[PDB]
Design a protein around this ligand. Structure first.
Ligand SMILES: CCc1cc2c(cc1N1CCC(N3CCOCC3)CC1)C(C)(C)c1[nH]c3cc(C#N)ccc3c1C2=O
Length: 298
């Protein structure tokens, strides 16, 4: 790409600088698309390795090209089991591809909605399944925090699962907001943002702690939209004024208490991710938490 070549942006993560020349270019003849899944995401294979393929439309702006490169650089430099892997890229053929770990369980929000206990599947999910998802994402967030990377958009829609069934691992699977900020409103994820985002606009890992609290609410509600029946501005005014969400239906007290600590008004009063993990791990050990039945959706 001449835009990518002429600009040739550097990307810094964890004290190391990378650029387009550092990306692992997979020959296009080795890549086959199998089906569309979800911009466009396809299932593909690399000669074989099963992958997810993100594509860049051939009709795109110069900014879109640079965005796509920065997304590749960002994902390629992460090294953690709870962040989706990047197999490589194919940027020297059109349309351009980024090749990612296939996450056959799909996105977490959709999974929660589709796998809710119902009279026909009364035991589809248990509390422990939800705590394992929470732990998995908290582990990824702790890696980001330890590497001074602020995600800015932790939400169930941005988490992915390795498979639908038992043994699934949840991973962070989108970095678009971080990418936009690295390169730099009705599209802001207001419902995931702490009060101070709207005051001084200052982001820290404590902003990700707040968002993680909202993710935990999403998990234990089985995929409900946060602040049901409030608009973005209503939520902004609500949370600023000290308003917080009620516990999800049947949510154990100890889990709800993790949410409420994540939502402390003062950032310094919120737990870091090592503390969040410890609390999630204690909940997972407590028989009265894990023996709590999830509500049936009639
Ligand atoms: C093979 C399965 C799959 C896999 C993936 C995805 C969706 C799927 N499916 C969508 C279709 C469903 N079906 C199941 C049958 O009923 C209809 C819905 C079953 C999940 C989505 C589109 C969510 C996805 N986004 C990604 C982003 C990044 C990054 N960075 C990396 C990987 C991904 C993936 C995936 O690997």
């Amino acid at each position: 790409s001449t835009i990518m070549t002429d600009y040739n942006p550097n990307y810094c993560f964890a004290g190391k600088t990378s650029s387009i020349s550092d990306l692992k270019e997979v020959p296009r003849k080795n890549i086959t698309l199998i089906r569309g899944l979800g911009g466009e995401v396809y299932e593909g294979q690399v000669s074989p390795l099963q992958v997810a393929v993100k594509t860049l439309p051939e009709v795109c702006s110069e900014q879109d090209e640079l965005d796509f490169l920065m997304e590749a650089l960002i994902i390629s430099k992460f090294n953690h089991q709870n962040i989706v892997r990047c197999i490589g890229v194919s940027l020297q053929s059109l349309p351009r591809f980024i090749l990612l770990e296939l996450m056959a369980g799909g996105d977490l929000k959709s999974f929660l909605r589709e796998t809710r206990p119902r009279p026909s599947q009364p035991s589809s999910l248990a509390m422990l399944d939800l705590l394992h998802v929470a732990r998995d994402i908290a582990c990824g967030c702790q890696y980001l925090e330890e590497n001074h990377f602020i995600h800015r958009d932790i939400a169930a829609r941005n988490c992915l699962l390795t498979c639908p069934g038992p043994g699934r691992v949840a991973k962070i699977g989108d970095f678009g907001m971080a990418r936009d900020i690295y390169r730099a409103c009705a599209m802001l994820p207001v419902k995931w943002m702490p009060p101070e985002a709207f005051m001084e606009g200052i982001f820290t890992s404590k902003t990700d702690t707040w968002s993680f609290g909202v993710l935990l609410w999403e998990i234990f509600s089985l995929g409900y939209m946060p602040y049901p029946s409030k608009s973005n501005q209503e939520v902004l005014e609500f949370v600023t004024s000290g308003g917080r969400m009620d516990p999800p239906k049947n949510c154990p007290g100890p889990v709800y208490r993790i949410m409420t600590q994540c939502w402390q008004h003062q950032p310094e009063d919120r737990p870091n991710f090592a503390i969040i993990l410890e609390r999630i791990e204690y909940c997972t050990q407590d028989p009265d938490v894990i023996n709590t039945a999830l509500p049936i959706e009639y």
